[PDB]
Design a protein around this ligand. Structure first.
Ligand SMILES: [Ca+2]
Length: 352
C-alpha cells in the first residue's frame, strides 16, 4: 500500500522486483545503493536500476555514548551521512531492532524513499549541516518510526551560536509531499525546517503521531504551503512550536500540548503571517493554558501567537484518508507506538 496517513503516498522499496539487502555499516548502505544503479550489463541506469529494501543492522552506540558525554566536541567534527541522490526506483531503509547510527540520511532529488526504525543521535558536524534526516527536492518521502535525538543545548562559541547540533528532519526545496510519522524526537534544539528561506515556500507536509520531548523550536518552522499536524504529543517545548510563516496554512488537530512555550505562533519575519485551523486538541480555550502549562512570549518584531486559541484562517480539504484518535488517547498511548522497536505499530481508536 502507498498509504502513510499523510500527503506522501509511497511503498518505498516494497514494490515489484525489489531486491533485499542487509547493510551492516554506513559504508555498506553506500556501496549497496551504488550497486543498485547498474543494469545487467554493468551500465548505470538513471534513477537506479532496481528497487531496494535495505535492512540496516549496524550499531554505533559507542560513538553515540561517547558524543553524549562531550556534546560540545561534536559541532566541529566532519559531518557523517549517507546521501540518497537521484534515486527514484523506490528505496526503503529500515533499521533492525537493536541497530543504531551516528550518521544521518540525506535525501536529494530522489523520490519514493522510506526511512523506518532508525535510532539516530548526537551527530557530529552541526556547523557543517550534519542533519539526522534531510529531505531536499524529494517528493513522496516517508519518515516513520525513528528515534532522533541529541541534547537540547547550545554550547558557547559555536558558529552563529546555533550549530552545536543540526536538525532532526529538515525539509526543503521541491519536497512536495512528505509524511513524518511516529517518531520519537527528543533533546533537539532545532527540530526541522519546512522551507529553507523566505523564497523556498510550498510543499504539503503531514506530521502525525510524533512524540516530541525537550525540544526548543521548529515543529516545523514552516514557510508557505500546507502542514497538517495531527495526533502529535508535544511536551517540554522550550522555545516555540509550530511557527507558521510566509502565508503558510496549518491544520492543527487532536494534538496534546503540555509544558510548552509559544506552541503555535508566527514570528521572526514581522510580516506575511501564516494561519491555523485549531480543532480537537487538549487545549480548547485560553483557560486551558494554565492547566497544561502553556506560556507565551512576545518577539521584538511584529508577530501573532495563538493566545486566543482561535482559528485564524482556513485549510483546504485534506486529500488523504486518516483517522485521528482523541488528544487524550495520544497523551495516554502514543509513547508506546512512537519510535524504534515498536514493530512499526500504529495507534488506532481500538487501542484507546
Ligand atoms: Ca540542516
Amino acid at each position: 500500500a502507498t498509504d502513510t496517513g499523510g500527503y506522501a503516498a509511497t511503498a518505498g522499496g516494497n514494490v515489484t522486483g525489489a531486491v533485499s539487502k542487509t547493510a551492516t555499516s554506513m559504508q555498506d548502505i553506500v556501496n549497496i545503493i551504488d550497486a543498485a544503479r547498474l543494469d545487467a550489463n554493468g551500465k548505470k541506469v538513471k534513477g537506479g536500476a532496481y528497487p531496494l529494501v535495505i535492512t540496516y543492522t549496524g550499531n554505533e552506540d559507542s560513538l553515540i555514548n561517547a558524543a553524549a558525554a562531550n556534546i560540545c566536541g561534536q559541532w566541529s567534527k566532519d559531518p557523517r551521512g549517507v546521501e540518497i541522490k537521484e534515486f527514484t526506483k523506490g528505496i526503503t531503509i529500515i533499521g533492525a531492532n537493536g541497530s543504531s547510527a551516528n550518521f544521518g540520511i540525506w535525501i536529494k532529488k530522489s523520490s519514493d524513499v522510506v526511512v523506518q526504525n532508525m535510532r539516530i543521535g548526537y551527530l557530529p558536524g552541526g556547523a557543517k549541516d550534519g542533519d539526522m534526516i534531510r529531505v531536499d527536492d524529494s517528493p513522496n518521502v516517508w519518515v516513520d518510526h525513528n528515534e532522533l535525538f541529541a541534547a537540547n543545548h547550545e554550547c558557547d562559541g559555536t558558529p552563529d551560536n546555533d550549530t552545536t547540533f543540526e536538525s532532526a528532519v529538515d525539509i526543503k526545496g521541491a519536497s512536495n509531499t512528505v509524511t513524518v510519522s511516529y517518531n520519537y524526537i527528543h533533546g533537539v534544539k532545532k527540530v526541522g525546517l519546512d522551507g529553507s528561506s523566505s523564497s523556498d515556500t510550498g510543499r504539503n507536509i503531514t506530521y502525525h503521531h510524533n512524540y516530541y520531548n525537550d525540544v526548543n523550536a521548529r515543529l516545523p518552522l514552516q514557510r508557505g504551503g500546507l502542514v497538517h499536524a495531527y495526533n502529535n504529543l508535544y511536551t517540554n517545548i522550550t522555545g516555540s512550536g509550530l511557527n507558521v510563516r510566509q502565508n503558510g496554512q496549518a491544520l492543527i488537530e487532536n494534538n496534546w500540548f503540555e509544558k510548552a512555550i509559544n506552541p503555535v505562533t508566527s514570528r521572526y519575519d514581522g510580516k506575511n503571517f501564516g494561519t491555523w485551523v485549531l480543532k480537537g486538541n487538549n487545549i480548547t480555550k485560553p483557560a486551558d493554558f494554565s492547566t497544561y502549562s502553556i506560556t507565551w512570549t512576545a518577539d521584538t518584531k511584529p508577530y501573532v501567537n495563538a493566545d486566543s486559541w482561535t482559528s485564524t484562517g482556513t485549510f483546504p480539504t485534506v486529500a488523504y484518508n486518516y483517522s485521528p484518535v482523541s488528544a487524550q488517547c495520544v497523551k495516554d498511548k502514543l509513547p508506546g507506538y512512537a519510535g524504534v522497536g515498536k514493530n512499526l505499530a500504529t495507534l488506532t481508536s481500538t487501542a484507546c
